[model samples]
Target chain A: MRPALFFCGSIRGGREDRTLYERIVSRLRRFGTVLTEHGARGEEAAGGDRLIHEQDLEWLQQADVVVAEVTQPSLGVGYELGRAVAFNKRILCLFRPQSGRVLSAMIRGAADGSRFQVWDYEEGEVEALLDRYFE
Target chain B: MRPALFFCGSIRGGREDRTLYERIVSRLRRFGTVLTEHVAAAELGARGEEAAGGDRLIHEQDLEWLQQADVVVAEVTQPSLGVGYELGRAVAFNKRILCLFRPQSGRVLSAMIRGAADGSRFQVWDYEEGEVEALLDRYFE
Candidate 1:
């Protein structure tokens, strides 16, 4: 069975992390079907998608897991994540240290031993994490 | 009157950054009264809310404290969902915010948080521990 995943990347603020978001989402496909492939392509713009903000929330609700690229910051990303947790959706977050960027405690602190995990990875290292996660 | 400030840190698993948390609170005192100083003290107790000797008012009390604060300073060196929730609420209420962290190779922040820091609505600083005092001075002054 394919796991329905809600994948989030910053459309406006975390543009720098876009390529990474693309990479991670590609790898995640090994695990299951990712619902928001558009998210990786900056599809959350005001006029870009026929789906609206509420529609995005609906997709998140149906997702078996919510995975996000946390290397960059976005208001929308946090909002979606907060909702995901409040709903008890399984969550996985990927982070990569950047020059002049500090990871937010809020994002890192979400780990609760179950249902949520935030992982730190370097370039080329995330593949292993995804393998273990999918296995 | 000094600003009523709320200081947030990740304690459950992100305790690796506690020393940094303490330093943040210390510098924050220079700006205003920090209402939830116990967060840095790790006095919240048991890790999942509730105190040993008193009522487990962690949720209620912390929310009250957050409501009372005029500014929020969160140490985001460690990622925590609880802290993220708090930051989201603080943003919802329109309180001024100072999100501080040091960049290390092993960890990076989520784009959502990075976006907030990059947002013009609040201030976000990636600083060395030694630079905290200067960072605080400039922001509070």
Candidate 2:
């Protein structure tokens, strides 16, 4: 079975978190069959009942790895990352190193934290970094 | 003597980290007399002569208070906030807090943390937040 992955991003009000979404989703699609796409509105129409309203959780259960763009700040993303951490999933946290050179104490101390690889996306570097994971 | 508060936020090759700066500086203005403002370009052209290249550090001295704040993550802001936390312990007069809010950490924590001389001004600049460097200021003359 292809590992089912969930691509997560934020969308406030009527607008989707489109700026970073464009960067996150395209690259994430290659990971496995994307199970669902969730906007910040926390909308999840495709995943039916008994599956839980939270799509990121289900994605974590069904997938082997979870790759997230930790840029721009999303509350939902933080929660999803938390769940993945609990499951001890192979996680990649790519954030703007602009904020701080080091990862937060919370993220750095996660169960999967040892396996986690965080990177800074420099211009064209996003694609290049995403490509390495595929290869 | 006035509080030599160290107001910290994000800056980039883009512009001023001003989207949330106005809200920050206004409330901060009430606290004490101000010093200098820094942009994402991380540019500061004042306070010289072996006092240290880092003005934020120099701001530490003589400033009755250091509110080194953080709403967005910055290599500098995070470190400054840490120093404030450390300095806060022995001073008998200090405060600090961190929250999921990068833009309003100081203000929000002031209301939330509420201990007078500790617990304050920490916020989260999570994934995909729009608190980018200021747009208009990019048009430098």
Candidate 3:
């Protein structure tokens, strides 16, 4: 199988979170390659900024699968999820269990990765799901 | 109060929407500024390649209420919500909402909006419930 590429949101808090990237990279290797937004954080998006671009699109087309942490709902992640779904790529969306509510918009709505499967696991359910998907 | 801006998501589908932003801009005018992630949408974030190094960190300070902002969240809209959000000086957010239904049968959520206000709350449009429930009825579909 081709190396699965992992896409990470940003590196902060609602401001953003980088831990997800580290966590994703650590586990996604079981599937394949994991790519980060490189330098940008999900929250610091500048005016007129876009999450999906030309270069990334090419990589997206070449990747085996896309895994997004819709943890806090990221436009960049949503865009990527949308793109991955469009390419008919197998996608695994990790939605952080809402503290009270159900799920987030960007988590499930961005596009339609629903064709194959979606893991709406709460805050701590993903680590194992990744294990299962790769096996 | 400066009719706080009410930001909407987009009229599009992921492709984009104009609901959340509309709701925020609607209810926001009450607090201060609620903007939308208008035209461009959020996903298109091109390969920007920049280093403001100095500009952004300035407003990032507290006294100006920049630093004190509660976790400070904005859509950047990301193309996720573009023009209107930009024009309004506010833009958009990340909550793209919908469910696992077929496409036509989807019980679309405005994607839900956060912050602009606190309290672990979510405002749904298209006639669900709450003071803003009616807003969802007209706009979210």
Candidate 4:
């Protein structure tokens, strides 16, 4: 069976980062079927449909793991991540340092790899990180 | 009885904002008793007896304070998992929430945060430190 993956990022919060999200989602496609790609074409929800709470939670419940681009701060991302943790979804967080902004403690504070793996990268570094992670 | 308030921000990632955090705390103190002020002051002052609940399970203690607070105010300029978690809990309790955001960073607040108060009691305002007093007067009123 193909691995089911749920991918999320700051849709409304980090709209400028949408292209980066698209890049990550496409790269993740090599590992398995990505469930939430279209959810980005501007939907009210992250995955599973549009209801931020109901549908999003349902998608997370079904995924084998959840990959999140946490460079941008989004309450939607936080809610999704928080839920993913509660459900014990394997998590991979990709972060890029933005000038004058720091990653939120909630994201940075998760004990490194205790529950999830945090990969810090510069431009074009995500490709190798995903390869190593998925391998 | 005075307003019981919860002041939250990022301690780990947004450590750069610690000075700004203390500034907000002092401003908040003018309107209500800031429960987490000592934690902020102690860390920033650096003379330090650890924060009152420093060694214990902080989550439970924070929940207790949220249950007791008249309002929950957070600085969303820097994203925080704990702050977001607290915001969600406050929403569950149907408590009033104020999110102070600085948009100059070019990152907009998430839709979840911007819309958190849409059908609920939470409110979000965007401003620099200079405008906080006016915003507080309006909110606390």
Candidate with the greatest TM-score versus the true structure: 4
Runs with alpha carbons beyond 4 Å of true place in candidate 2: A11-19, A38-53, A98-103, A108-114, B1-141
DockQ of 2: 0.02
TM-score of each model, paired residue for residue? 0.53, 0.41, 0.43, 0.60
lDDT of 3: 0.39
Order of all candidates by lDDT, from best down to worst? 4, 1, 2, 3
Candidate 1 positional error at A89, Å: 13
Sort candidate 2 into its docking category: incorrect
List candidate 3 stretches off by more than 4 Å: A14-16, A37-52, A98-102, A105-116, A122-125, B1-141
Residue A39 of candidate 1: its Cα lDDT?
27
The TM-score of predicted model 2 comes to 0.41
Residue-level lDDT of model 1, residues B31-56, one tens digit each, is 78887734532543333122322322
Q: Place model 3 in a CAPRI quality band.
A: incorrect
Which regions of candidate 1 deviate over 4 angstroms?
A1-135, B12-14, B37-56, B118-120
lDDT of each: 0.67, 0.40, 0.39, 0.67
- Write the residue-wise lDDT of candidate 4 on B2-117 in tens digits: 78999877554245655677677777888898876326332532321122233223545566787889889888876555577567667667788898888886766665666555
Steric collisions counted per model: 24, 28, 56, 1
TM-score of candidate 3 on Cα atoms, chains taken together:
0.43
List, residue by residue over A1-135, the lDDT tens digit for candidate 3: 557475644333542245555666677766666654335434325311222244455676777777666544344455555556556777776655453323332233333434434465644555687888777
Tens-place lDDT digits, model 3, residues B75-122: 233223221112112212323221111123243211112211123222
